[PDB]
Design a protein around this motif. Structure first.
Motif, PDB file in Angstrom:
ATOM      1  N   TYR A  36     -26.762  23.870 -14.437  1.00 21.08           N
ATOM      2  CA  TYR A  36     -27.789  24.241 -15.436  1.00 21.08           C
ATOM      3  C   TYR A  36     -28.061  23.205 -16.510  1.00 21.08           C
ATOM      4  CZ  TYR A  36     -27.314  28.654 -13.112  1.00 21.08           C
ATOM      5  OH  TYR A  36     -27.302  29.627 -12.135  1.00 21.08           O
ATOM      6  N   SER A  37     -27.193  22.207 -16.634  1.00 19.17           N
ATOM      7  CA  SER A  37     -27.377  21.213 -17.709  1.00 19.17           C
ATOM      8  C   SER A  37     -27.786  19.811 -17.245  1.00 19.17           C
ATOM      9  CB  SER A  37     -26.127  21.140 -18.626  1.00 19.17           C
ATOM     10  OG  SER A  37     -26.071  22.263 -19.535  1.00 19.17           O
TER      11      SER A  37
ATOM     12  N   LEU B  83     -29.428  19.275 -14.036  1.00 28.04           N
ATOM     13  CA  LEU B  83     -30.238  19.517 -12.821  1.00 28.04           C
ATOM     14  C   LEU B  83     -30.976  18.293 -12.263  1.00 28.04           C
ATOM     15  CD1 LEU B  83     -31.254  23.025 -13.837  1.00 28.04           C
ATOM     16  CD2 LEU B  83     -30.351  22.414 -11.479  1.00 28.04           C
ATOM     17  N   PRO B  84     -31.567  17.472 -13.134  1.00 30.72           N
ATOM     18  CA  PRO B  84     -32.327  16.355 -12.559  1.00 30.72           C
ATOM     19  C   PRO B  84     -31.480  15.241 -11.927  1.00 30.72           C
ATOM     20  CG  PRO B  84     -32.884  16.691 -14.902  1.00 30.72           C
ATOM     21  CD  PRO B  84     -31.632  17.502 -14.614  1.00 30.72           C
TER      22      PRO B  84
ATOM     23  N   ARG C 216     -28.708  13.173  -9.586  1.00 37.04           N
ATOM     24  CA  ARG C 216     -27.851  13.155  -8.400  1.00 37.04           C
ATOM     25  C   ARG C 216     -26.477  12.603  -8.752  1.00 37.04           C
ATOM     26  NH1 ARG C 216     -32.837  12.125  -9.412  1.00 37.04           N
ATOM     27  NH2 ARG C 216     -32.441   9.883  -9.087  1.00 37.04           N
TER      28      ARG C 216
ATOM     29  N   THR D 169     -29.374  10.433 -14.223  1.00 36.90           N
ATOM     30  CA  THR D 169     -30.565  10.834 -15.016  1.00 36.90           C
ATOM     31  C   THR D 169     -30.211  11.440 -16.388  1.00 36.90           C
ATOM     32  OG1 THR D 169     -31.648  11.215 -12.881  1.00 36.90           O
ATOM     33  CG2 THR D 169     -32.825  11.989 -14.813  1.00 36.90           C
ATOM     34  N   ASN D 170     -28.956  11.825 -16.548  1.00 36.30           N
ATOM     35  CA  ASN D 170     -28.542  12.483 -17.810  1.00 36.30           C
ATOM     36  C   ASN D 170     -27.393  11.749 -18.498  1.00 36.30           C
ATOM     37  OD1 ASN D 170     -30.189  15.131 -17.888  1.00 36.30           O
ATOM     38  ND2 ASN D 170     -29.434  14.935 -15.769  1.00 36.30           N
ATOM     39  N   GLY D 171     -27.227  10.481 -18.155  1.00 34.82           N
ATOM     40  CA  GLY D 171     -26.216   9.608 -18.770  1.00 34.82           C
ATOM     41  C   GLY D 171     -24.787   9.938 -18.358  1.00 34.82           C
TER      42      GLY D 171
ATOM     43  N   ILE E 135     -38.739   9.336 -14.198  1.00 36.90           N
ATOM     44  CA  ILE E 135     -37.794  10.343 -13.745  1.00 36.90           C
ATOM     45  C   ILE E 135     -38.490  11.306 -12.796  1.00 36.90           C
ATOM     46  CG2 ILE E 135     -36.415  12.386 -14.442  1.00 36.90           C
ATOM     47  CD1 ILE E 135     -35.651  10.713 -17.000  1.00 36.90           C
TER      48      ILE E 135
ATOM     49  N   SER F  26     -38.736   9.744  -9.291  1.00 36.33           N
ATOM     50  CA  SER F  26     -37.473   9.726  -8.560  1.00 36.33           C
ATOM     51  C   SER F  26     -37.036  11.133  -8.186  1.00 36.33           C
ATOM     52  CB  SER F  26     -36.377   9.042  -9.378  1.00 36.33           C
ATOM     53  OG  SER F  26     -36.594   7.644  -9.406  1.00 36.33           O
ATOM     54  N   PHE F  27     -37.234  12.084  -9.094  1.00 41.80           N
ATOM     55  CA  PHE F  27     -36.860  13.468  -8.834  1.00 41.80           C
ATOM     56  C   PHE F  27     -37.628  14.009  -7.620  1.00 41.80           C
ATOM     57  CE2 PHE F  27     -37.483  18.006  -9.159  1.00 41.80           C
ATOM     58  CZ  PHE F  27     -36.180  18.475  -9.453  1.00 41.80           C
TER      59      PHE F  27
ATOM     60  N   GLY G 213     -30.081  13.314 -25.123  1.00 44.08           N
ATOM     61  CA  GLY G 213     -29.796  13.695 -23.734  1.00 44.08           C
ATOM     62  C   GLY G 213     -28.477  14.457 -23.547  1.00 44.08           C
TER      63      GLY G 213
ATOM     64  N   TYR H  88     -34.103   7.111 -22.103  1.00 45.00           N
ATOM     65  CA  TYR H  88     -34.094   7.527 -20.706  1.00 45.00           C
ATOM     66  C   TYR H  88     -33.299   8.838 -20.529  1.00 45.00           C
ATOM     67  CZ  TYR H  88     -33.183   7.533 -15.701  1.00 45.00           C
ATOM     68  OH  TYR H  88     -32.946   7.904 -14.401  1.00 45.00           O
ATOM     69  N   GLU H  89     -32.115   8.909 -21.141  1.00 45.16           N
ATOM     70  CA  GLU H  89     -31.299  10.143 -21.081  1.00 45.16           C
ATOM     71  C   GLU H  89     -31.960  11.288 -21.834  1.00 45.16           C
ATOM     72  OE1 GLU H  89     -30.322   6.981 -22.058  1.00 45.16           O
ATOM     73  OE2 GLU H  89     -29.193   6.474 -20.254  1.00 45.16           O
TER      74      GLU H  89
ATOM     75  N   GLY I 282     -34.383  12.579 -19.548  1.00 43.80           N
ATOM     76  CA  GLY I 282     -33.573  13.422 -18.639  1.00 43.80           C
ATOM     77  C   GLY I 282     -33.345  14.852 -19.177  1.00 43.80           C
TER      78      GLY I 282
ATOM     79  N   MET J 297     -36.525  16.659 -18.632  1.00 44.53           N
ATOM     80  CA  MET J 297     -36.625  17.000 -17.214  1.00 44.53           C
ATOM     81  C   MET J 297     -35.742  18.228 -16.882  1.00 44.53           C
ATOM     82  SD  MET J 297     -38.377  15.960 -14.462  1.00 44.53           S
ATOM     83  CE  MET J 297     -38.237  16.696 -12.733  1.00 44.53           C
ATOM     84  N   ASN J 298     -34.537  18.274 -17.441  1.00 39.93           N
ATOM     85  CA  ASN J 298     -33.712  19.477 -17.267  1.00 39.93           C
ATOM     86  C   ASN J 298     -34.431  20.750 -17.726  1.00 39.93           C
ATOM     87  OD1 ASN J 298     -30.849  20.262 -16.289  1.00 39.93           O
ATOM     88  ND2 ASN J 298     -31.099  21.381 -18.231  1.00 39.93           N
TER      89      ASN J 298
ATOM     90  N   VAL K 204     -37.008  21.756 -15.123  1.00 43.05           N
ATOM     91  CA  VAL K 204     -36.400  22.428 -13.966  1.00 43.05           C
ATOM     92  C   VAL K 204     -36.007  23.881 -14.299  1.00 43.05           C
ATOM     93  CG1 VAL K 204     -34.579  22.334 -12.220  1.00 43.05           C
ATOM     94  CG2 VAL K 204     -35.765  20.202 -12.911  1.00 43.05           C
TER      95      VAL K 204
END
Lengths: 324, 324
Positions: free
Chosen positions: A158-159, A161-162, A164, A295-297, B21, B24-25, B149, B309-310, B313, B316-317, B320
Motif C-alpha cells: 500500500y505504500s 505500489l509504483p 518494482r 520509484t519510492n527511494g 514514472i 515506466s509504470f 517521498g 523523483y521520489e 513516486g 504515483m502511489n 494507484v
C-alpha cells in the motif's frame, strides 16, 4: 456498522493480546467496523458461540481457568464449517508446515479468508497455499510472520505500489542477533545462554533460532511476497552460530532478498557491517529493515521494541485490510 | 487491463518526473493498470489530447520547446470538463491557498478526484476542501505534501489502521534544518546563505522556509489527517531562524503533532534533542519521523535522500490507491 465474524485459533501471547486489541478496537475505531468472535481455541479448549464474550475469555485465560467456560465445544474442522468471515492462525508452528497447509486448505474450501501469525505453512508450502486460495477465491495475509509488528507487507502492498522492489535488507531474527552481540561483548556462549534462559530471551529448544533457521523461514515468505517466486526452505541460504569463533561489534545476521543474476534470491548471513550501516543503529530489541525501491527511494523502517502486543497489532491490521 | 485517465497540472521537477514514472509504470506494473494522460499544463502551455504522447511531452519539456507541440489548447476549466478520472496538482503553491481551493472545487464538481503535491489549499482551506469533496462524492490524496517521498499518509491509512495515533515527531522541513546544522558548525548566516544559493539548496526567496512557515503548513495537513481536526495555519505554532544566536549540534526544527490537553496540537520548534534521539540520526538530506501508536508500537520511518523523483513516486502511489 459493518460486523466481521472471526474464529481465533491460538491463545498464546499473540492470540490473547489480539483479543484485548479487538475489544479496544470495537470500542474506539472510527472505521465503522466491529469484530465479533464466534470461536476461540487454545491447545486445551475449543469454544463456539454466536457471540463469544471476549472479556470473559481474556479473564479466564489470565486466571488459567478456561476449563470453566460453558460454551459449545466443537473441533477445528466443525468450527470452519460454521458461518464466519476470517480465520486467525496464532497457533504454534509445526516443524514441517503440513498441519498449517491442511488447515488453510480446509479454511478456503469452507469459504473463509486467513490471517496468520504462524510462518510454518508459508515457509514450506507457499505455492500450494496460494493455489488453494486462488481455487477457492479466498485471501490470506501474514503481516505478523516477518518483522513482528513493524509494517512490512502492508508497507509493500500500500505504500510503494509504483516500485518494482530492488532489494530488502533487515534484522528480522532477534534472538540469534542478541547472542551474536553478547558474544561480541567478549562473553562465553554458555554464560550468554544461561542468562538468556533465566531472562526468557531464549526458549528451552533454541536450535531453530541459533542455527539461523528462524531467519531462513522468514526469508522464504519475504522473497515469495516480493518477487512472486514459489520458494520453499531449500531455495534460500542461511547460517547460524552453533562453530567456535569471536564476533566483532559490527556483526549481525542480516536477512537480504533481491533479484540476483535474474533470479529471486534470499539469504541470512552473518556480516560485519560498515560502521555507518543503518542496521547497526537498531537496539537488541528492535526489528528493522531497509527497502531499496526503484520509484519510492530507499526507505528505512523499524520499531523501538518488538513484542507480542505489537505483533497482535499487525494481525489486527491484516484483519482491517481484509474487511475494508 | 484497467485504464485510468489523468490530467496533470504542473511540469516542474515533480510533474515532469511523474510523467517519466507513468511511462515506466505502464510498461512494468503487475497491477493490471495503465495510466493514460489526456491533458498536461505548465505555466506557459495547456495541451489536451485523447492520448497525450507522454514521451514527446518529456522530450519537448527537457529541450525547452513545448511551444512546438501541436495538441489542442484549452484552459484549465475546460480541461476539467473533459472525460477523465483524476487531476494531479503539481503546480506552484500560492501564498493564500485560494487558487487551490477554487481548483479542487471545480474538479470535484466535474466529477474527478484530486492527487496533490501542492500544500497551499490544504494548509489554508482544509475544511472547505473536504466539504466540497464530500458534497460531490469525490476523493483527494496528498502524500507528496508532507515528508516528500517517505510513505506517511499511506502508512497511516494502510499500515497502522488499528491504532488511535498518539503522536508524531519528525524532520519534515529540510532547508531550515540544513541552515541550523551549518550554523552549528560555527558558520556565519551570510556565508551559509551564500553557498546554499550557489548549490541550489535555498530559493531566491527563502523566507517561507527559514521562518518555519514551510514546516507550519505541513503540520496543518499532518494534524488534520491524524486527528480529524479542521485547522488552518493560525491553529499551529511555528518558529524560525531569521534573531542572532549560536546553535548546538543537537538542535533541529522538529514538527510534532499529538492530542494535548484533549485538543489536537501541532508545533514546529527548535529543540536541542537528546544525543540518542532517532531524529538526530538523519542526514541533512533525509526526511524521517517517529510515529507513536497505541496498537502498533513506536515506528521510525525515513528515506536516505529526499528528491523530486521520489516525491513524484509518492504522487504515483496515491494514483494507484485511488485507482485500485
Amino acid at each position: 456498522m459493518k460486523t466481521i465474524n472471526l474464529s481465533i485459533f491460538g491463545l498464546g501471547n499473540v492470540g490473547l493480546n489480539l483479543l484485548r486489541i479487538i475489544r479496544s478496537f470495537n470500542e474506539e475505531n472510527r472505521l465503522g467496523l466491529k469484530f465479533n468472535v464466534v470461536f476461540v481455541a487454545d491447545s486445551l479448549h475449543s469454544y463456539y458461540n454466536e457471540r463469544i464474550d471476549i472479556g470473559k475469555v481474556i479473564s479466564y485465560k489470565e486466571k488459567g481457568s478456561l476449563d470453566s467456560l460453558e460454551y459449545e465445544s466443537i473441533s477445528a474442522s466443525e468450527a470452519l464449517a460454521r458461518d464466519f468471515d476470517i480465520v486467525v492462525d496464532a497457533t504454534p508452528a509445526s516443524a514441517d508446515g503440513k498441519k498449517e497447509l491442511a488447515f488453510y486448505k480446509e479454511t478456503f474450501e469452507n469459504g473463509k479468508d486467513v490471517v496468520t501469525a504462524n510462518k510454518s505453512g508459508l515457509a514450506n508450502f507457499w505455492p500450494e497455499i496460494m493455489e488453494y486460495a486462488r481455487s477457492n477465491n479466498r485471501r490470506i495475509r501474514y503481516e505478523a510472520t516477518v518483522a513482528g509488528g513493524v509494517p512490512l507487507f502492508s508497507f509493500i502492498d500500500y505504500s510503494v505500489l509504483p516500485s518494482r522492489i530492488k532489494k530488502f535488507r533487515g534484522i528480522v531474527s532477534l534472538t540469534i542477533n542478541y547472542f551474536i552481540r553478547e558474544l561480541a561483548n567478549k562473553r562465553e556462549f554458555d554464560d550468554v545462554l544461561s542468562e538468556a534462559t533465566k531472562l526468557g530471551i531464549v526458549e528451552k529448544n533454541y536450535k531453530d533460532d541459533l542455527t539461523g533457521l528462524d531467519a531462513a523461514r522468514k526469508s522464504v515468505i519475504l522473497c515469495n511476497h516480493l518477487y512472486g517466486s514459489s520458494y520453499r526452505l531449500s531455495d534460500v541460504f542461511y547460517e547460524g552460530i552453533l562453530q567456535d569463533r569471536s564476533f566483532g561489534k559490527n556483526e549481525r545476521l542480516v536477512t537480504e532478498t533481491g533479484i540476483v543474476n535474474g533470479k529471486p534470491s534470499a539469504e541470512s548471513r552473518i556480516k560485519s557491517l560498515d560502521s555507518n550501516d543503518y542496521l547497526l543503529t537498531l537496539g537488541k530489541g528492535s526489528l528493522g529493515y531497509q527497502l531499496q525501491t526503484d520509484t519510492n527511494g530507499t526507505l528505512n523502517v523499524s520499531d523501538l521494541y518488538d513484542g507480542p502486543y505489537e505483533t497482535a497489532g499487525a494481525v489486527m491490521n491484516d484483519l482491517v485490510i481484509l474487511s475494508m
